[model samples]
Target: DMRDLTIIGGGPTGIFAAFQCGMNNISCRIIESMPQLGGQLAALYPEKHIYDVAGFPEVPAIDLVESLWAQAERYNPDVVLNETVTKYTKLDDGTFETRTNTGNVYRSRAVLIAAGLGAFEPRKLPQLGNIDHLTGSSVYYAVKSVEDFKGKRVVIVGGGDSALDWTVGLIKNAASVTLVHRGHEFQGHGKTAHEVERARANGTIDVYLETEVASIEESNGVLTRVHLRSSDGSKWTVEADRLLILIGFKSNLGPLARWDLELYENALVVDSHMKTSVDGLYAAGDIAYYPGKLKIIQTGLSEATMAVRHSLSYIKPG
Candidate 1:
């Protein structure tokens, strides 16, 4: 089906752009690679709190995403999930055809590439090789819900904000929470690091710094133990029912890299108006970059709005 606009990402920016299009009486569709909408916020850090968005002093990431989805759905744009856009071609008449990995085809007058970080996968522990078959039940890269970990022995590995945040958040829910990091220094925010340290001091959680996971033992595909090695020649083992690997994610542009757009370090180059070098095609969100750009949700929101406004002229030329 032909749409007035087609958005190639379903993250915050893409959702908001659809909403904007709907408000402008433009028919649009959002194509997301993930099964659900919300992108990284819903997939990677839904339970985390965000403080940068305007108005709210603090808002849960999931809550913010839900509100955005609700607002976008009011305009009733078509939502396609679990399909990666594999090929994009400009037809003879200035229209574009986009093909997805699922063999679905969509035609649109204009395209908005709000694909944040394109396709991404979690950075796994090197000690565990090709054990992705063990993900859903015993090993997890992202926490879908905190309740899933209730009364379970949880071993979180990482030194970043996600690791520290989950370490503190799950202390009360899990039967036991152990945080193991390869480095002594943590990369979380100062306040969160302080809270984690305080949690460790008060015996709320077990923290192992400068330690690495030497090996993992499983029983019938279920994680049962995590052997740790410290830089100081110390070794220990932690009995665990679940393992949360929150190290971070490795992102790639995937099919987008071959799109022939002007790119700087795999990110689409956009002007102040969020217009790309390709005519009738624009980019926003984390995937769009400019000089003095700030990689934040608010910035993406602004860029999406601007891109949508600018796209109207191309969609409805006099």
Candidate 2:
């Protein structure tokens, strides 16, 4: 589709930017790789309550995504799902030609990259035998609701913020909860770690330090129990109604990276106005990198605003 703006990734940044673009009366299109929209923020984990996001006291990841999706779709830009951009070419006439993995093509005067931290995979279960059996029945990379876990015994696997946050939530909702981490040390904030320690002390959650899932048992589409192994080769069986795994994250530049633009580390480098090294090209979200220490939603949204402002100077007059 020919449009004034073509947004890639359809994550929070892309979705929000598209909505903003439409509000400014600019024709736009959003192409997303996943069948479900909202990108990583939508699917990566459930029970992950975001506390630092501006304007919200606390909101579940899914809930936040839903709100963003509703806002983004309100403007009604062309939104496509399960379409992945594979290539992007800049024309001498100051427009962009983009193609998707499914062979769909489009031309636009501006492009936005909101592909956040590419695709994510769960951390490998170490020294676990018959790991594949845990596929659909028992093990999971994320948790969505307390209802699925209500009245059931659950184990949260991870040492990160998502893990601790979910553990706290489960303690309030699940029948019983256990926590296992790879190392004695945790990667989350110290205050969060302290809260978890207090929870363990108060019997809110059981803590198993320096342990990993050894094996799992599934029968008749039900997960019964899983073996836990410690570093010293100690093994124990834990009655598990469900398993929640929150390992980490990863990202790709999507089609924007293939344009031969300048790169800083693994991200596409952009200027103050969020324009990429290539003329008339812009990027947003976690995938776009500037000279900064870290990337966050604040940066992504701000960059998107800047990108659109700069892009207006290049828009063709009717």
Candidate 3:
């Protein structure tokens, strides 16, 4: 489908930029790699409290995203999720077309790249040989709902906040929770780590440190058992209905790397007006490289303002 602009990221900046486009009567579509909007704020730290965002003394990260979402949603700009744009080319008619990894394509007059921290993909459990086919069924990188794990034996692997947080939260309903960590020490918030340690001590859950998930056994398409190996050369298998790998994410500007935009440290170089080297393509947020750059959300908002306004002129052509 054709639109006025195609926003390549659904982060805070991208969402706001889409709102700006709507305010200017421009039809646009937003493409986000994550299943949800709000980008890092939603993916990395939805519960983390912050203060710098204007208009609130204390606001949770997800709170800001929710407010921004409402403001943009009211305008009804098109938003697509869980799709990563892998390629884009200038059409012979001076329009732009972006193709996603799924082969879906959209035509637009202009493009805005607000990909904050690029596409985020959870780290895979490589030790579980050839488990690629099991993802989203028995192996999950994200928790879309908690009720899905009710009365189910779940195996969580990671020493980070995501693992600890989910383990502590999911234990209330899961029939059994088995946590696997490669290191003895956990790298997460003190409160969350404390809860997990307490749970481990009280037999509420099973915690295995310095252990690796050696492999997994599958029945049909669902993983049913997780084979683990310890640092002491001991091996064991835990009956699990689901394998949750909270081992962080792989963040990068995927596919966009092949574009001809001038890159410095993986960020596209942009002028003061936030225009990139390539025509019809504008960069903002952390993906926009420029002198005196500040990688803050506020600065990105300002950059988005400039980018959208300039793109308006380019799109309409005086």
Candidate 4:
């Protein structure tokens, strides 16, 4: 079936575009690469807080996403998850065809790429060889929320700000937090590093350095344990319900890179109207680049509104 618009990436921008489409009485569909929406806010830093978005002096990332989802759900637009868009092109008839890696095709009168920073994957642990299939549930690269790991043993890997921040944040909630790093010291902010060090010193958390997750033990599609090995050859196993790999991410434009759209610094270049180099196809969010553009959620959401507004005329010409 054909739709009025298809939005790529389910982050804040794409979700806002879906909301705008619904408000304008446009048939809309959102294709997300992750299991759910919220994008980076939902995955990378769900447990963190945001101070920049208007309306609140400070807000939890999870709470903002919840409100966005509920606001968009009022019109009940169609949504597809876990489908990474692989190709987007205009047909001879002026419609657009969106193909996913799963071989599914979505056709729309216009396409809006709100894919923030394209498709990004966490820098995985080399010690856990060939565990790509075990990601999302038992093994995760992002933290969904605190409740998901409440009273459950979780293994956190990385030495960055995220790792240090979550280390101090999750100690009281999780059954146990085992922190691992491949280097000698915390590579994050000094203040948070000191907080985590204090927690470790006071026996609130277990800290390890020059260590790696050597192997994983899975039973019945559930991860049971992780083997930790230190550079000194010290090795041990920890019962872990989830493996939260918080290392930095590798972000790229992916298949969009091969498209004909003009690109700058890995982002699609757009005009004042958020229209891309190609007709009937648009872009916004961090993926959309413009002169003096600011890469923030508020800006991305505003860009989404502009794209949807321009797309409405492109579709109906009223």
Candidate 5:
């Protein structure tokens, strides 16, 4: 399909770009690998609060994604979900060609590489094979609802704020929760850390210091056991109905990496116009790389808006 601008991601930047382009009567399309929008906002710890974003003093991660999704659809940009761009080629005529895993082809005068680290897949649990079996059933990275795991034993992996937050959020819902960290010290906020300490004292959340998952297995197609090795050289199997791993996220430059784009620590390359080394190419969000650029939402949105303005100048309608 022909488009004036094609966005390769559906995260905040891509969605914002689509809204801007659509408002300007610029035909655009957005393809995302995930089933939903909002990017990291949707995948972050459910109860974890975001204070860096402007306007709102503090907002839940999921709510932020919802707001961005609503705003992006205002301009009616074409959005495709569960799709991934496998390859992209620059046409001699200055246009670009894109091929998706779904066998769909797209052409555009310009393309925005807003795909922030591609999809946010959870880092694999240590020594766990066929990880897909645990997703949504007994293993998860983000919490969608509290009641989903009500009356079940949960094992949370992490020493960060996310682990603490989830442990607190799931206390009333979960029958029991055990928090295991690879290190002995916690790296969360003082107040939160104190709260976790109090919870641990009250026996609301079990703290397994200096522990790591050594092995995992499921019984009857449900989460059953996880072998944990503690710092004291003691190893034991913990029965768990659910597992929440919050290690972090990984990203790749994907097809855009092959282009003449510049590099910032080998991440993404962009210029003042939010343009890459290739004339018709642009990038925003966490995937964009520029000197002295910040990767927060504010910067992502600012860069995306700049990219839209530059893109409009590059391909002004006759």
Candidate 6:
């Protein structure tokens, strides 16, 4: 399909850019690799609170993503999900052609790459190697829905905001929730950390610090128990039906790295105007790199705005 502008990511940055394009009366489309929109916020940390966004003192990651999507949908841009752009080529007519892994093709007068961290995969636990059979049925890298844990025993492993937030969110739904961390200190929001402590004290959640999963026992392809070991060598077993490993993610540029654009540190190099090395193509969000660039969501929003506006100018050349 042909469009005036094609956005390469559907996160906050790409969604905001689509909103801007809609306001400008530009026909645009957004292509996202994930099955759902909102990118990392929706996939990795939906329950976590964000404080950096403008106007709101604090908002949940999922809430922010929902608001952004609502604002962008006002313009009615075409949204394509579960597709990754595997090939990109510039046509002789100065337009761009992008082919996805699904054999779909998209053509656009201009392209904006807002892919944050390019393609990302969750970091898996080495202790649970070669256990692919137990992935979707028992183990999860991210929570798709909190309701899935309802009435089930859930064990979360991580020391970050994701772990704490999921623990707090699942306390009311899950039959039992246990949070296990290999470190004494939680690398998450201080307020949420305190809330986790309070929840543990109130018997709403179980907190185990300096603890690591020693082994997992499964029965008939379903996980049943998790053996845990603490720093002091204390060992215990927790009954679990669902296990969430929110350790973190590993990101790669993927096909984007082979796009032949000038790159610095695996991110597309851009100028002050968010214009990439290629003509009629721009890079924004975490995939964009400039001197003194900050990789925060707010900064990414600003970059997206700049990229879209500049792309409009390039398409119209006024």
Model 6, which residues run further than 4 Å from truth?
44-51, 57-63, 118-120, 127-130, 133-156, 160-179, 186-208, 213-244
Off by over 4 Å in 4: 125-157, 160-245
Error of 2 at 272 (Å): 0.6
Candidate 2, position 39, lDDT: 75
- In the range 162-254, model 2's lDDT, one tens digit per residue, is 888888888877888999998787875567777678888888779988998877766777678878989999999988888887766545554
- Evaluated with lDDT, which candidate comes out highest? 1
Point out the higher-scoring one by lDDT: 1 or 2.
Answer: 1
Local error of candidate 1 at residue 54 (angstroms): 2.6
Question: Cα RMSD (Å) per model?
Answer: 4.9, 6.3, 4.1, 6.3, 4.8, 4.6
lDDT of 4 by residue, 225-302 (tens): 989999989999999987888888877787889887799999999999999988789999989999999999999989
Name the regions of candidate 2 deviating beyond 4 angstroms: 121-181, 185-249, 254-258
lDDT of each: 0.89, 0.77, 0.87, 0.87, 0.81, 0.88
| Ten-residue region with minimum lDDT total, candidate 3 | 188-197
lDDT of 3 by residue, 166-227 (tens): 88888888999999999878885577666667888999999999998988888888878999
Q: What is candidate 1's CA lDDT for residue 117? A: 87
TM-scores for every predicted model: 0.73, 0.65, 0.77, 0.71, 0.71, 0.72
Which digits, one per residue and each the tens of the lDDT, describe model 5 over residues 1-318?
788898998877888888878767788989887888777777555456889989979998778777777887777778888888777788888888878889988898888988887577666575776678668888888778777679998899887777777888888888888899887788756687876877888987788879988888788878887789987889999888888887666566666566555777757777889888888888888998877878788888888888988898777744
How good is model 6 by TM-score? 0.72
Clashes of 5: 0
Residue 64's lDDT in candidate 3: 87
lDDT of 6 by residue, 1-318 (tens): 689888998999999999989988888999999989998899877977899889979899999999999999988999999999888888989898888999999999999999888656787778877878988778889898776788999899998877877888888898999999888779955787766688888887788989999999999989899999999999998899999998888787888888878989878899988998888899899889999999889999999888888788778777
Among these predicted structures, which one has the highest TM-score? 3
